[PDB]
Design a protein around this motif. Structure first.
Motif, PDB file in Angstrom:
ATOM      1  N   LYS A   1      -0.556   2.584 -10.578  1.00 14.90           N
ATOM      2  CA  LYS A   1      -1.948   2.985 -10.345  1.00 14.90           C
ATOM      3  C   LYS A   1      -2.683   3.294 -11.648  1.00 14.90           C
ATOM      4  O   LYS A   1      -3.466   4.239 -11.732  1.00 14.90           O
ATOM      5  CB  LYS A   1      -2.030   4.157  -9.366  1.00 14.90           C
ATOM      6  CG  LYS A   1      -1.538   3.787  -7.986  1.00 14.90           C
ATOM      7  CD  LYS A   1      -1.373   4.980  -7.105  1.00 14.90           C
ATOM      8  CE  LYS A   1      -1.275   4.567  -5.660  1.00 14.90           C
ATOM      9  NZ  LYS A   1      -2.531   3.940  -5.194  1.00 14.90           N
ATOM     10  N   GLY A   2      -2.420   2.488 -12.674  1.00 10.86           N
ATOM     11  CA  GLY A   2      -3.092   2.611 -13.948  1.00 10.86           C
ATOM     12  C   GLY A   2      -2.576   3.700 -14.854  1.00 10.86           C
ATOM     13  O   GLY A   2      -3.214   3.989 -15.871  1.00 10.86           O
ATOM     14  N   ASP A   3      -1.446   4.310 -14.529  1.00 15.83           N
ATOM     15  CA  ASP A   3      -0.885   5.398 -15.318  1.00 15.83           C
ATOM     16  C   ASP A   3       0.181   4.827 -16.247  1.00 15.83           C
ATOM     17  O   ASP A   3       1.205   4.318 -15.787  1.00 15.83           O
ATOM     18  CB  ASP A   3      -0.311   6.475 -14.403  1.00 15.83           C
ATOM     19  CG  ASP A   3      -0.412   7.858 -14.999  1.00 15.83           C
ATOM     20  OD1 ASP A   3      -0.525   7.970 -16.234  1.00 15.83           O
ATOM     21  OD2 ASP A   3      -0.375   8.839 -14.232  1.00 15.83           O
TER      22      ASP A   3
ATOM     23  N   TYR B   1       4.466   6.372  -7.105  1.00 13.32           N
ATOM     24  CA  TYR B   1       3.744   7.211  -8.053  1.00 13.32           C
ATOM     25  C   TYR B   1       4.187   8.661  -7.946  1.00 13.32           C
ATOM     26  O   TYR B   1       4.276   9.360  -8.960  1.00 13.32           O
ATOM     27  CB  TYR B   1       2.232   7.102  -7.833  1.00 13.32           C
ATOM     28  CG  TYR B   1       1.423   7.841  -8.878  1.00 13.32           C
ATOM     29  CD1 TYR B   1       1.101   7.235 -10.081  1.00 13.32           C
ATOM     30  CD2 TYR B   1       0.986   9.144  -8.665  1.00 13.32           C
ATOM     31  CE1 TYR B   1       0.376   7.902 -11.037  1.00 13.32           C
ATOM     32  CE2 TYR B   1       0.269   9.815  -9.616  1.00 13.32           C
ATOM     33  CZ  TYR B   1      -0.032   9.190 -10.799  1.00 13.32           C
ATOM     34  OH  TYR B   1      -0.755   9.859 -11.750  1.00 13.32           O
ATOM     35  N   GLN B   2       4.433   9.138  -6.725  1.00 17.11           N
ATOM     36  CA  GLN B   2       4.849  10.522  -6.534  1.00 17.11           C
ATOM     37  C   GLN B   2       6.249  10.753  -7.078  1.00 17.11           C
ATOM     38  O   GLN B   2       6.554  11.838  -7.580  1.00 17.11           O
ATOM     39  CB  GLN B   2       4.780  10.885  -5.054  1.00 17.11           C
ATOM     40  CG  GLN B   2       3.431  10.624  -4.443  1.00 17.11           C
ATOM     41  CD  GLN B   2       3.256  11.279  -3.099  1.00 17.11           C
ATOM     42  OE1 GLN B   2       3.517  12.466  -2.936  1.00 17.11           O
ATOM     43  NE2 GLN B   2       2.805  10.507  -2.124  1.00 17.11           N
TER      44      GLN B   2
ATOM     45  N   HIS C   1       0.822  -1.201   0.000  1.00 20.73           N
ATOM     46  CA  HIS C   1       0.000   0.000   0.000  1.00 20.73           C
ATOM     47  C   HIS C   1       0.859   1.255   0.000  1.00 20.73           C
ATOM     48  O   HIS C   1       0.559   2.222  -0.707  1.00 20.73           O
ATOM     49  CB  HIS C   1      -0.937  -0.003   1.205  1.00 20.73           C
ATOM     50  CG  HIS C   1      -1.728   1.257   1.350  1.00 20.73           C
ATOM     51  ND1 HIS C   1      -1.386   2.252   2.239  1.00 20.73           N
ATOM     52  CD2 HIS C   1      -2.837   1.691   0.709  1.00 20.73           C
ATOM     53  CE1 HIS C   1      -2.253   3.243   2.143  1.00 20.73           C
ATOM     54  NE2 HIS C   1      -3.146   2.926   1.223  1.00 20.73           N
ATOM     55  N   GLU C   2       1.936   1.255   0.778  1.00 19.53           N
ATOM     56  CA  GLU C   2       2.769   2.436   0.926  1.00 19.53           C
ATOM     57  C   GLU C   2       3.866   2.537  -0.120  1.00 19.53           C
ATOM     58  O   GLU C   2       4.359   3.640  -0.368  1.00 19.53           O
ATOM     59  CB  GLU C   2       3.387   2.460   2.323  1.00 19.53           C
ATOM     60  CG  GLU C   2       2.361   2.597   3.423  1.00 19.53           C
ATOM     61  CD  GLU C   2       2.971   2.545   4.805  1.00 19.53           C
ATOM     62  OE1 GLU C   2       4.156   2.169   4.921  1.00 19.53           O
ATOM     63  OE2 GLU C   2       2.263   2.883   5.774  1.00 19.53           O
TER      64      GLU C   2
ATOM     65  N   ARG D   1       2.281   6.070 -19.712  1.00 21.75           N
ATOM     66  CA  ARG D   1       2.589   7.170 -20.611  1.00 21.75           C
ATOM     67  C   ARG D   1       3.793   6.802 -21.460  1.00 21.75           C
ATOM     68  O   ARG D   1       4.661   6.043 -21.030  1.00 21.75           O
ATOM     69  CB  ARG D   1       2.892   8.470 -19.854  1.00 21.75           C
ATOM     70  CG  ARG D   1       1.899   8.863 -18.785  1.00 21.75           C
ATOM     71  CD  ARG D   1       2.439   9.989 -17.952  1.00 21.75           C
ATOM     72  NE  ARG D   1       1.631  10.234 -16.769  1.00 21.75           N
ATOM     73  CZ  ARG D   1       1.212  11.432 -16.390  1.00 21.75           C
ATOM     74  NH1 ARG D   1       1.515  12.496 -17.108  1.00 21.75           N
ATOM     75  NH2 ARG D   1       0.480  11.566 -15.301  1.00 21.75           N
TER      76      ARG D   1
ATOM     77  N   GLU E   1       3.275   1.654  -3.314  1.00 25.34           N
ATOM     78  CA  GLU E   1       2.579   2.075  -4.524  1.00 25.34           C
ATOM     79  C   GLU E   1       2.238   3.556  -4.488  1.00 25.34           C
ATOM     80  O   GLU E   1       2.134   4.191  -5.541  1.00 25.34           O
ATOM     81  CB  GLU E   1       1.316   1.240  -4.719  1.00 25.34           C
ATOM     82  CG  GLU E   1       0.834   1.208  -6.156  1.00 25.34           C
ATOM     83  CD  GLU E   1      -0.338   0.280  -6.370  1.00 25.34           C
ATOM     84  OE1 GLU E   1      -0.813  -0.319  -5.385  1.00 25.34           O
ATOM     85  OE2 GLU E   1      -0.785   0.151  -7.527  1.00 25.34           O
ATOM     86  N   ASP E   2       2.076   4.123  -3.295  1.00 26.53           N
ATOM     87  CA  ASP E   2       1.791   5.546  -3.176  1.00 26.53           C
ATOM     88  C   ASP E   2       3.045   6.384  -3.372  1.00 26.53           C
ATOM     89  O   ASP E   2       3.007   7.404  -4.065  1.00 26.53           O
ATOM     90  CB  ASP E   2       1.163   5.843  -1.817  1.00 26.53           C
ATOM     91  CG  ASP E   2       0.861   7.312  -1.625  1.00 26.53           C
ATOM     92  OD1 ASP E   2       0.311   7.934  -2.556  1.00 26.53           O
ATOM     93  OD2 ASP E   2       1.177   7.850  -0.545  1.00 26.53           O
TER      94      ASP E   2
END
Ligand SMILES: *[C@@H]1O[C@H](CO)[C@@H](O)[C@H](O)[C@H]1NC(C)=O
Ligand SMILES: *[C@@H]1O[C@H](CO)[C@@H](O)[C@H](O)[C@H]1NC(C)=O
Ligand SMILES: *[C@@H]1O[C@H](CO)[C@@H](O)[C@H](O)[C@H]1NC(C)=O
Ligand SMILES: [Cl-]
Ligand SMILES: [Zn+2]
Lengths: 595, 198
Positions: free
Chosen positions: A335-337, A23-24, A16-17, A339, A19-20
């Motif tokens: 998280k589904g991003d 992303y940042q 959980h932590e 590019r 993946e957050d």
């Protein structure tokens, strides 16, 4: 509770932590690479520091789960990815000493420049200018100077640094219970634990040397053809029985032979297939190139690109106000991003680069349902091998007239497929003896089998024996000729470029059987074939959760790296090369030197 | 002659939805239940009724109606169903296996996602046992994952049970916020007050 159930609970908190915070870091890295700003530098440096401070703390906490009383191989795989110490087993004064040599090496490499002995005010860096001399000059002494002075200035500064770099990296790996640092690099292929899919770290050396013995019939016929064609561009400098001089191979190190196509073309009056001029007559743009790329992937049954792909990617150079790093990259932010960063010109090479970076996104999209530490390729060669078989099918004259870029009344003959296949082998076959001995030299330097007073002695004894490339000048032990390459100065494993090249045609021949293709392997287009796309996706979905030997079996059907699909690809070229090298000596003599 | 409509506008068209661990129950009674607010369907796409027909909603009459509202991810809307297992179904919101009622869900990305992250929406990650159906656990007691009693503080093998969601608009669907309303139809052997329009 048992120590394995406390480890599943620890990894649920971690996933959980992680993946957050990843992303940042990735979104701040995206914002800098699209908008180069000092505030975008500080956003990128602070978001990446929080992610490295988090991953350092969770590495310490994961070591309290012993990895001995844990029997699930899925839980064991992500704990040992997180339990990797790295340079933390070294002392703190040697951990800063090792980081000092690593940052000095990239500084000497990137900011090293060579001044010509004609005017002291003018000098030349490597990436512009000195790469242009080694690529396009047809004068012998002009590129002999640029080859020697790059190694007699920049390679001399890296010789006392590389002797200290090997010692501390071997101390780091022996404290991590390996044998040496070359053994730590071979741990990307170690699959101890699974019955029927095991792989040891020493097994990689034997499997690389076994597959290389079959490349040597194809390579020494390409070496004998390039040498016979370079006797016309540089006469009275090449021996008919000798090796090739190291400064005539098209670039700085002889890594790729792709810049030798102007001199080694079979049928030079016939032009290559280039649909760049056919693209502008139909008014293609960057959006059309990338929608034709994702049209190709839904034809084999893979998903189309997401809604946030077309909203968040950078598919065009945004002009000379918005300054971006123009290197084609596929981004999996989590998280589904998804590019793709690319500055796309309306060209044939950007059309095949669009299929390359979209093959990376489709593989990132497939293992998105894995735990966070299992979201990678099956090994380090898997991820680039998937993007390379998409450019392989898209460049075929079958695929290029099915989208309307070639004429419908186009006839391909045998005098153009040899021109295609030889341009491939200059890039693909011509880089495999370079890749194999540069890792075999590094594997023996870390193992201590080459003492440091004989480094350039066995660097050129192996460059003559394996690659067939001779030094143009004598070199003592003040030079460091490997570290003049980027990957040796910047601490990168190099055998991933060897194993990717063998996975690529292993992947391509398997999807070619599933698409039921008629004739030669180089004419294969896996488009409009959902059986080829469903066999690929069963490997793409696993990510890092299974053995790579098992993920290789999900497409190919074998459990190991195999070179017979590579030799099957260049089979019409090998037939034409064996007929051409009839009046010439096939092979080289390592005793001949040009000095 | 029509009568007083049921207050579904303060359920669906709210501005504050709950966390899934602390989901808001609303009791609806003594009104005419117009289920023709389904005409909002272009954002309101998910509509799945269990134990009752979607078209025969006004055919039946009920004593009480419970509306449960929260926010989950897009990939967890499949867990709001009878007989499902997951993080939401086990520790946050459990439906009964003989569930009569409907589940309405819709994407809330342009309302519940911040560019810096919407950390206001929570969910329970750790719990000692699975929830009973329609149980609400809102405790912030430190979860004991190991064998030491954890002393009321969070450390090694002792975790805080509630985690956040951190909704950002550039997420893919499956990590974007979804507002969920669960309608629960009761028959309590009483005067059946909640009826459809005749
Ligand atoms: C291992 O763990 C995963 C998830 O924690 C679980 O799905 C699986 O059943 C476990 N056992 C095996 C043999 O993979
Ligand atoms: C993928 O998305 C594109 C863009 O709208 C659409 O044209 C195409 O039909 C989609 N394909 C599938 C298989 O959903
Ligand atoms: C797939 O088949 C259709 C119909 O035969 C054709 O128009 C299209 O070009 C094909 N796509 C490929 C080969 O990528
Ligand atoms: Cl060299
Ligand atoms: Zn690539």
């Amino acid at each position: 509770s048992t120590i394995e159930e406390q480890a599943k609970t620890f990894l649920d908190k971690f996933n959980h932590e992680a993946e957050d915070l990843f992303y940042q870091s990735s979104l701040a890295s995206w914002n800098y690479n699209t908008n180069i700003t000092e505030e975008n530098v500080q956003n990128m440096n602070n978001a990446g520091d929080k992610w490295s401070a988090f991953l350092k703390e969770q590495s310490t906490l994961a070591q309290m789960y012993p990895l001995q009383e844990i029997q699930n191989l899925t839980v064991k795989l992500q704990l040992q990815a997180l339990q990797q110490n790295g340079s933390s087993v070294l002392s703190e004064d040697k951990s800063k000493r090792l980081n000092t040599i690593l940052n000095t090496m990239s500084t000497i490499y990137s900011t090293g420049k060579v001044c010509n002995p004609d005017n002291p005010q003018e000098c030349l860096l490597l990436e512009p200018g000195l790469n242009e001399i080694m690529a396009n000059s047809l004068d012998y002494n002009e590129r002999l100077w640029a080859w020697e002075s790059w190694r007699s200035e920049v390679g001399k500064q890296l010789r006392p640094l590389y002797e200290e770099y090997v010692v501390l990296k071997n101390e780091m790996a022996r404290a991590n219970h390996y044998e040496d640092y070359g053994d730590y690099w071979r741990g990307d292929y170690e699959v101890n634990g699974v019955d029927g899919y095991d792989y040891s770290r020493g097994q990689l050396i034997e499997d690389v040397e076994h597959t290389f013995e079959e490349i040597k019939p194809l390579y020494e016929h390409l070496h004998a053809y390039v040498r016979a064609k370079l006797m016309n561009a540089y006469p009275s400098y090449i021996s008919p029985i000798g090796c090739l001089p190291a400064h005539l191979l098209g670039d700085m190190w002889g890594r790729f032979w792709t810049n030798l196509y102007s001199l080694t073309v079979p049928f030079g009056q016939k032009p290559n297939i280039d649909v760049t001029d056919a693209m502008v007559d139909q008014a293609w743009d960057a959006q059309r190139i990338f929608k034709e790329a994702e049209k190709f992937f839904v034809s084999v049954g893979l998903p189309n690109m997401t809604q946030g792909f077309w909203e968040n990617s950078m598919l065009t150079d945004p002009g000379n106000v918005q300054k971006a790093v123009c290197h084609p990259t596929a981004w999996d932010l989590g998280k589904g991003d998804f590019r793709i960063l690319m500055c796309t010109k309306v060209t044939m090479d950007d059309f095949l680069t669009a299929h390359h970076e979209m093959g990376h996104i489709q593989y990132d999209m497939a293992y998105a349902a894995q735990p966070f530490l299992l979201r990678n390729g099956a090994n380090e060669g898997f991820h680039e091998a998937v993007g390379e078989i998409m450019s392989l099918s898209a460049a075929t004259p079958k695929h290029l007239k099915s989208i309307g870029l070639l004429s419908p009344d186009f006839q391909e003959d045998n005098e153009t497929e040899i021109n295609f296949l030889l341009k491939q082998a200059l890039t693909i076959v011509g880089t495999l003896p370079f890749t194999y001995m540069l890792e075999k030299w590094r594997w023996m330097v870390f193992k201590g089998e080459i003492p440091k007073d004989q480094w350039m002695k066995k660097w050129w004894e192996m460059k003559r024996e394996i690659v067939g490339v001779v030094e143009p000048v004598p070199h003592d032990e003040t030079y460091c000729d490997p570290a003049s390459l980027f990957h040796v100065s910047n601490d990168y494993s190099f055998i991933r470029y060897y194993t990717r090249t063998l996975y690529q045609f292993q992947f391509q021949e398997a999807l070619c059987q599933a698409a039921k293709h008629e004739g030669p392997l180089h004419k294969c287009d896996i488009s409009n074939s959902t059986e080829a796309g469903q066999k690929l996706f069963n490997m793409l979905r696993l990510g890092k959760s299974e053995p790579w030997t098992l993920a290789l079996e999900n497409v190919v059907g074998a459990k190991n790296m195999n070179v017979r699909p590579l030799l099957n690809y260049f089979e019409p070229l090998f037939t034409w090369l064996k007929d051409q090298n009839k009046n010439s000596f096939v092979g080289w003599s390592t005793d001949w030197s040009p000095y | 002659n029509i009568t007083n409509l049921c207050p579904f506008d303060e359920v669906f068209n709210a501005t504050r939805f709950a966390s899934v661990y602390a989901w808001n129950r609303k009791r609806i009674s003594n009104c005419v239940a117009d289920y023709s607010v389904l005409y909002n369907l272009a954002p309101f796409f998910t509509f799945k009724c269990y134990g009752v027909s979607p078209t025969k909603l006004n055919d039946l009459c009920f004593t009480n109606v419970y509306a449960d509202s929260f926010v989950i991810r897009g990939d967890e809307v499949r867990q709001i169903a009878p007989g499902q297992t997951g993080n939401i179904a086990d520790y946050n919101y459990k439906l009964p296996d003989d569930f009569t009622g409907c589940v309405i869900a819709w994407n809330s990305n342009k309302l519940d996602s911040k560019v810096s992250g919407n950390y206001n929406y929570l969910y329970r990650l750790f719990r000692k046992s699975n929830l009973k159906p329609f149980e609400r656990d809102i405790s912030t007691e430190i979860y004991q994952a190991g064998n030491k009693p954890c002393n009321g503080v969070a450390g090694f093998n002792c975790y805080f049970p509630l985690r956040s969601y951190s909704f950002r608009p550039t997420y893919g669907v499956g990590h974007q916020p979804y507002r969920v309303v669960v309608l629960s139809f009761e028959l309590l052997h009483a005067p059946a007050t909640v009826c459809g329009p005749k």
